[PDB]
Amino acid sequence: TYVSLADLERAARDVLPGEIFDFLAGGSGTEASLVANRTALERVFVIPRMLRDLTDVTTEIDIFGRRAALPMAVAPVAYQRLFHPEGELAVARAARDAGVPYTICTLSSVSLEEIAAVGGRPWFQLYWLRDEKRSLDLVRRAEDAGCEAIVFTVDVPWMGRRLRDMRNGFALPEWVTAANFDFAPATWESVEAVRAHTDLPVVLKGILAVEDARRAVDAGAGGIVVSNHGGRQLDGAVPGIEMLGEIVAAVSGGCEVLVDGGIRSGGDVLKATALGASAVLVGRPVMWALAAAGQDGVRQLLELLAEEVRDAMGLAGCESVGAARRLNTKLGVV
Amino acid sequence: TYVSLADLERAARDVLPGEIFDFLAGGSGTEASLVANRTALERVFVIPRMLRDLTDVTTEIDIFGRRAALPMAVAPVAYQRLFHPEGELAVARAARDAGVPYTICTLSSVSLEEIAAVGGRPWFQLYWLRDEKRSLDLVRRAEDAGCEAIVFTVDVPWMGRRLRDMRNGFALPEWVTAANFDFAPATWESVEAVRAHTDLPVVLKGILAVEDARRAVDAGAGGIVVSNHGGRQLDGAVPGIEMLGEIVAAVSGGCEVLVDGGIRSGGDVLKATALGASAVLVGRPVMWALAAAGQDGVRQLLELLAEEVRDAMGLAGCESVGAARRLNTKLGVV
Amino acid sequence: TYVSLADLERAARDVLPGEIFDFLAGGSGTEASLVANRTALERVFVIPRMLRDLTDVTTEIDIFGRRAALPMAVAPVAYQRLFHPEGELAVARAARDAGVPYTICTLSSVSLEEIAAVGGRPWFQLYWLRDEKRSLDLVRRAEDAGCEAIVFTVDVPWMGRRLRDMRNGFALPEWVTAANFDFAPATWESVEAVRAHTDLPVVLKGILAVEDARRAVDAGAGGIVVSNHGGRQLDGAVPGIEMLGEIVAAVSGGCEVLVDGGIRSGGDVLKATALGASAVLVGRPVMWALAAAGQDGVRQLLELLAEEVRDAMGLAGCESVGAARRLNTKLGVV
Amino acid sequence: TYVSLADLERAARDVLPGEIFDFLAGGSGTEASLVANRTALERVFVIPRMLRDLTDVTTEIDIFGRRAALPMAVAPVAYQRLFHPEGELAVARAARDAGVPYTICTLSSVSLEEIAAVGGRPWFQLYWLRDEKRSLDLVRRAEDAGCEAIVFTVDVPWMGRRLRDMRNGFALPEWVTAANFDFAPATWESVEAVRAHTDLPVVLKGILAVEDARRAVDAGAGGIVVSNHGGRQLDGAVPGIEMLGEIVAAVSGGCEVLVDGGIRSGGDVLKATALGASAVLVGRPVMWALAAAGQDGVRQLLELLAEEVRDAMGLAGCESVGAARRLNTKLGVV
Ligand SMILES: Cc1cc2nc3c(=O)[nH]c(=O)nc-3n(C[C@H](O)[C@H](O)[C@H](O)COP(=O)(O)O)c2cc1C
Ligand SMILES: Cc1cc2nc3c(=O)[nH]c(=O)nc-3n(C[C@H](O)[C@H](O)[C@H](O)COP(=O)(O)O)c2cc1C
Ligand SMILES: Cc1cc2nc3c(=O)[nH]c(=O)nc-3n(C[C@H](O)[C@H](O)[C@H](O)COP(=O)(O)O)c2cc1C
Ligand SMILES: Cc1cc2nc3c(=O)[nH]c(=O)nc-3n(C[C@H](O)[C@H](O)[C@H](O)COP(=O)(O)O)c2cc1C
Ligand SMILES: C[C@H](C(=O)O)c1ccccc1
Ligand SMILES: C[C@H](C(=O)O)c1ccccc1
Ligand SMILES: C[C@H](C(=O)O)c1ccccc1
Ligand SMILES: C[C@H](C(=O)O)c1ccccc1
Ligand SMILES: [Mg+2]
Ligand SMILES: [Mg+2]
Ligand SMILES: [Mg+2]
Ligand SMILES: [Mg+2]
Questions:
Q1: Pick from B297, B303, B233: which is nearest to B80 by CA?
Q2: Which of D193, D228, D165 is nearest to D33 (CA)?
Q3: Which long-range CB contacts under 8 A does B169-178 form with residues at least 24 apart?
Q4: Cβ under 8 Å to C: B residues 242-301
Q5: β-strand pairing of C66-68 with C61-63
Q6: Cα(D102)–Cα(C152) distance, rounded to whole angstroms?
Q7: Which residues of C are annotated as a binding site for FMN?
Q8: Domain FMN hydroxy acid dehydrogenase, which positions (chains A, B, C, D)?
Q9: At residue A113, what are phi and psi to the nearest 5 degrees?
Q10: Centroid of chain to Cα D61
């Protein structure tokens, strides 16, 4: 049994090789943005409401055309066989069973068709390739396999400088491969090429500037993920949670606005919701659970997060996620 | 002899079983709100006035129809026999002798009639039950026994997740029982049912949102306690002391506004008063004193707090608690 | 040789009995205000000016009718024989030689007439007595002995609770006495009685509220000291340096505005000046120097402070203390 | 190989005598301004832009009539033979090869003519001398030798009090000399004398007040360096990075605005650019690299900084330094 997400990190620390734990845990540069993701959530305080009807509290939301059990999805994390032999299949099975969308990576270590066959609500994360034709063929594969959204990651014109990995001389084990294969910087023209090629909602992941959020809506995006890529891309990039409220106001309901970076509890989900998020992504904790106990581990994590979200919502007087979005917050110190 | 409230915590640490000290000390989740109650008071600085007449300094107030010796009451704390064999009777006797109201708990480990028989100024704290009829019968019992106010706790639709207790596998000893017995979420309709059933002032404990404070006045409450339940309910709830000034302005004298969470000295009482509170509740320190030295311990604590309140008021140029409410404050760093 | 004021504290730590070092170093309550005096100065940053004429840099000021060599005076500190056998005479001699005013205490351990006979620029600090007649006789003694200002301390209706002393069971050694003798709370009426009884400037020490500073000017004060008494009176009182700018604006040249609390370098003097102070008082460091090396120690301290003030002023482009008062500041973090 | 600038500091720590490492590392007084230079950069977060064309990312700028490879120059640091036997020649060679301007010091330990003969883009830093005639002859020498700008340091009417050096009794080794020789405070009249005597751009280094920046433009300066001299002059002077935005707005393109103090990575260069700087100076890290590995060390440092600047710019969506100046920032906590 685990009673917090912190329980699982210690467990994953135990089991994983040091270099692999560092690949997972690390950020770019001095890890300023990595730390700031946590600092930013810790400074947010919720103003709960009392004495409201809680006879039918529900944590469900509708997003991109389908119901989800929680306002949460599993973030795209590449090469999950690094953490457990069943890799993406273990995580996708647990996500399916929990009613949580699972984001299949361009750099998955099991093919996207195999992961989609698990069922559930798969999304597909796109990295822009070489040339437009192969990029669009990846999108077409994902759509043909039943993925329900295209999560276009737009904050990686190239990879950030992860000093832990450089110092470790970390490289992919020979037994881990990019299973979708036998890359180039994305632009707004790339976004349009994707939008024109699919009927699925296109979700732009890695948006931080208010003007980019507006332009995303103008570009026909169905959603954005306000994100600094877990502090792994620009070191010194603002945390998404610090831009979220401004961005939600600027898009004024024109697309779904998700956030990620440092979500470590149901209370953190509540904070993100109160700042205006439609839903959150969760990355590293899902991999901790995967490393610690495979599919059963991820199941326990999602069960824990589900109870924490329900608990936080009720304690704050919210019978629905919509009500949680109307909560006010106060920024504190430390 | 003790010279601060911190003296008593160390003493209680000595004597109590670890699990019981943790039950008392702990908060929910990561204990962010528990810590923030203290941080919030430590950031408040008072601007004292000089050269005022202090020939008749008095710490007395009138509240809910009776005089109190200090602008303070003992907070409701369940199951006080956990901390000393005389439990609630020891605390209520010391409170009586000090001229301080004592809040009798729904979950008291000595029956409310026995505690009320001690005399003094007993209040009764209500948790909403099963059905309206038994809830109202608890209120009627309290009124029949001479309680002078009903403190309706409204921030517990269910109990927060106290991780210390879960990790300890903490459970009530067989020798501790809910002596008032041989629960359901409260709503505004529950508040109205109570108000219609008693002539006693109804005080809503656990209010943090400004709109809930206004609605409390509209609902006929005689008071509110601005409170995040000592950081034991929603982890990430704002401290009451951070909402107090706004709330006092919004109710504009329509009801008494009390505050609790982290009050650990007479200087802290002065800060709360200067921010607009009518009075404070004090929880954990009263239990420290109870654990350390029973009734005599609680007596010493209340004597110490009485001298600290008188000292702080005079040093700040206040001959009355009303004058202290007109003090200005400045928010500092750390 | 000493290169900072911190050098001297370590030296005084060496030589003094622990209880006496604690009497000197300590504050009231939790020492929040003691620490905040330092925090507040450390958050202030100066915006220096460049390329100004520094051919005749002078640190001199005129205050209360006489020239002083620095914008600084020795703060009133009672019972200086606690720290060195020559007590007040050693400090007053060093102050005289440095061209710095020395404040003789009501509770001096050498008689005020003996200390005044040293020469220099003595001020006299008044604590209000028993009855108006003896208070005024103390003032008359001081004036007859050649004191040039009456520093009326107004923040001590009674002494703050110094927990170090209580825990130490600290008491005056039999060999230390209040040499001016063989107390009651002051009011504005007391201030008027003093003002009517002397032609010397009356300076009110311990003012923190803006309205009290205004009333001081209205009352005929020649100056005020913006001060929380070194964190020894109300624990939680705002630092004087945090109120100084507001107070200087409110009195708009109607009286001299001095500040004290935590001044530990020439750079700190510059910060106080830039915030608008006429001059500062320095307390504990003078006693460190006295304890460490008697009169010669205090001489070295004042020489060090004089060089640091001159250095800071020049580096900031100020040829006079008046120019330093026109410097701008920026408040930082930590 | 080094992967950050912090790698090099540890290396320099190894090799240098303690007193020399302290001369390099230290600040004046309590080193408040030294620490604040770093704190100030760490509080700045960049808001990156996405999906922009990065097909021709360039870190080049034009400044003072010539192209530079990066928006950076080597800061003036006196007596570089203290750190390596080749001193200034090693650094100037590496700077030349990297396409970075090198600032030759008035107090260089190799003559300015020898360093200029290395080639590249030498600037010359002026300290005002004794009399106008010799000051101007130093300027004339620099111009005759091919220096392209005069960096007039204006924040040293005299040297700050470096307590590390005093405590170390640090003095120039006999084998290190001021090679340009066989000083007086500068004023605006000195600036005019220099401006009238050369056609080179005059750059005023050590400006912090907005009014001084304006006056610099009015005085005919071609640039300013917003700087508190690495925390080595007035202790308590605001960091340049805290004044930079205000200053850039006030001069409104009237001169180049550079900044220095604490630049330790390409991300830090990006922050300075986003706040409006034309370019930065880098001081201590260049000396770390010099101490650690001579010319090759400085080459590796500049290669590392060049890759970090390119990386940060691209991750932030900037194909040019001009685009980086249009980035927005958000100030955070810690
Ligand atoms: C090991 C690792 C691999 C990742 N791989 C991807 C990826 O392939 N595509 C992507 O868009 N984001 C990737 N991310 C970023 C996550 O989707 C997410 O933005 C970040 O992890 C969220 O922060 P959290 O881990 O603090 O919950 C990765 C993150 C980590 C730690
Ligand atoms: C052990 C414990 C038991 C408590 N039981 C109750 C309770 O039965 N009813 C209630 O309204 N509050 C209860 N509280 C909350 C207190 O009334 C109060 O809000 C909180 O303790 C005040 O903070 P303080 O302990 O920092 O002074 C309890 C608190 C503690 C620590
Ligand atoms: C040991 C001690 C004795 C003091 N005695 C007096 C006193 O008799 N009268 C008075 O007005 N202030 C007294 N003060 C307060 C000082 O005048 C001054 O306000 C405070 O020390 C200034 O702060 P600093 O010590 O940080 O420089 C005393 C302070 C100390 C530490
Ligand atoms: C050892 C040392 C010597 C310096 N010598 C000079 C100098 O001769 N002239 C000058 O204008 N600045 C001098 N400086 C200041 C630097 O030019 C620069 O303002 C500061 O070092 C920049 O901060 P950084 O070292 O944090 O990068 C010196 C700094 C150091 C550390
Ligand atoms: C996004 C993910 C990451 O590590 O942040 C990644 C790993 C390797 C290659 C591309 C992306
Ligand atoms: C409020 C109090 C508490 O522990 O906070 C409590 C304990 C047991 C059951 C209900 C409430
Ligand atoms: C003001 C000074 C003090 O200790 O702060 C004092 C000591 C004894 C009695 C009165 C005042
Ligand atoms: C500026 C530089 C310094 O150390 O900051 C310096 C050293 C010796 C003499 C003058 C200047
Ligand atoms: Mg997250
Ligand atoms: Mg309390
Ligand atoms: Mg002082
Ligand atoms: Mg720098």
A1: B297
A2: D228
A3: B170/B19, B170/B20, B170/B22, B170/B23, B172/B79, B172/B82, B173/B82, B175/B81, B176/B79, B176/B81, B176/B82, B176/B109, B177/B109, B178/B79, B178/B106, B178/B107, B178/B108, B178/B109
A4: 265, 267, 270-271
A5: antiparallel
A6: 61
A7: 125, 153, 205, 260-264, 283-284
A8: 1-334
A9: -65, -40
A10: 16
Q: Which helix (H) or strand (E) holds A279?
A: strand A279-282
Quickly tell me which residue has 């300013």 as its tokens. D224
Whether B234 sits inside 8 A of A45 (CB atoms) is no
Q: Which atom of ligand 3 is nearest to the CA of C151?
A: 11
Are the CB atoms for C16 and C24 separated by under 8 Å? yes
Cα of A79 from ligand 12 centre, angstroms: 39
D223-226 and D61-63 as β-strands: parallel, antiparallel, unpaired? unpaired
Q: Which residues of A touch B40 (CB under 8 A)?
A: 332
- How far, CA to CA in Å, does A74 sit from each of A9, A282, A289? 17, 5, 12
Closest CA to C248 of C220, C276, C219: C276
Resolution in angstroms comes to 1.6
Instruction: Kindly give the number of the ligand 6 atom that is closest to the alpha carbon of B183.
Output: 10
Report how far apart, in Å, the C-alpha atoms of B138 and of each of A50, B158, B202, D175 are: 22, 19, 14, 92
The answer, for C49 touching chain D at a CB cutoff of 8 Å, is yes
Q: Kindly give the residue spans of alpha helices, DSSP state H, lying in B225-283.
A: 240-251, 266-274
Exposure string of B287-315, with b = 16+ CB inside 10 Å and e = fewer, is: bbbbbbbbbebbbbbbebbbebbbbbbbb
Structural domains in chain C?
5-326 (3.20.20.70)
| Helix, strand or coil, per DSSP, at residue A186 | coil
Of A157, A206, A238, the CB nearest to D46: A238
Confirm or reject contact between A166 and chain B (CB < 8 A): no
Tell me the Cα Rg of chain D: 19
CA B105/CA B180 separation, integer angstroms = 9
* Chain D residue numbers touching A333 (CB-CB < 8 A): 333
Residue with the two structure tokens 């020939």:
B55
Angle in degrees, CA A111, A117, A119, rounded to 5: 130
Q: Residue A218 — φ and ψ, nearest 5°?
A: -60, -35
Q: Which chain B residues contact residue C29 at CB under 8 A?
A: 4, 265, 267, 308
Task: State the CB neighbour count (10 A cutoff) for residue B195.
Answer: 18
In this structure, are residues B266 and B274 in contact, taking their beta carbons and an 8 Å threshold?
A: no
Q: Of A84, A195, A229, A299, which one is the catalytic site residue?
A: A229
Determine if residue C159 is left, alpha or beta; phi over 0 gives left, psi from -120 to 50 gives alpha, anything else beta. beta
Say whether D316 and A234 touch across the interface (CB within 8 A). Answer: yes
Whether the CB of C107 sits within 6 Å of ligand 7: yes
State the DSSP code for C237. Answer: B
The whole-angstrom distance between B264's CA and the closest CA on chain C is: 10
How far is Cα D178 from Cα A49, in angstroms, rounded to an integer? 72
Evaluate whether D184 touches D130 at the Cβ level (below 8 Å): yes
Q: Is D232 annotated as a binding residue?
A: yes
Cβ atoms < 10 Å from Cβ of C252:
9
CB within 8 A of D125, min separation 6: which ones? D76, D103, D104, D105, D106, D151, D152, D153, D205
Elucidation technique: X-ray
Quick check: helix, strand or coil at residue C325? helix
Tokens of C240: 């004087």
**Would you state the structure tokens that stand for residue D322, as one six-digit string?**
């001009």
What ligand 4 atom has the least distance to the C-alpha of D151?
A: 11
| Ligand 8: lining residues by beta carbon, under 6 Å | D 78, 107, 159, 229, 232
Q: Which two tokens stand for residue B295?
A: 């009734």
Distance from CA of B262 to the nearest CA of A (A): 16
Neighbours of chain D (3+ CB pairs under 8 A): A, C
| Cα–Cα dist C106/C88, whole Å | 12
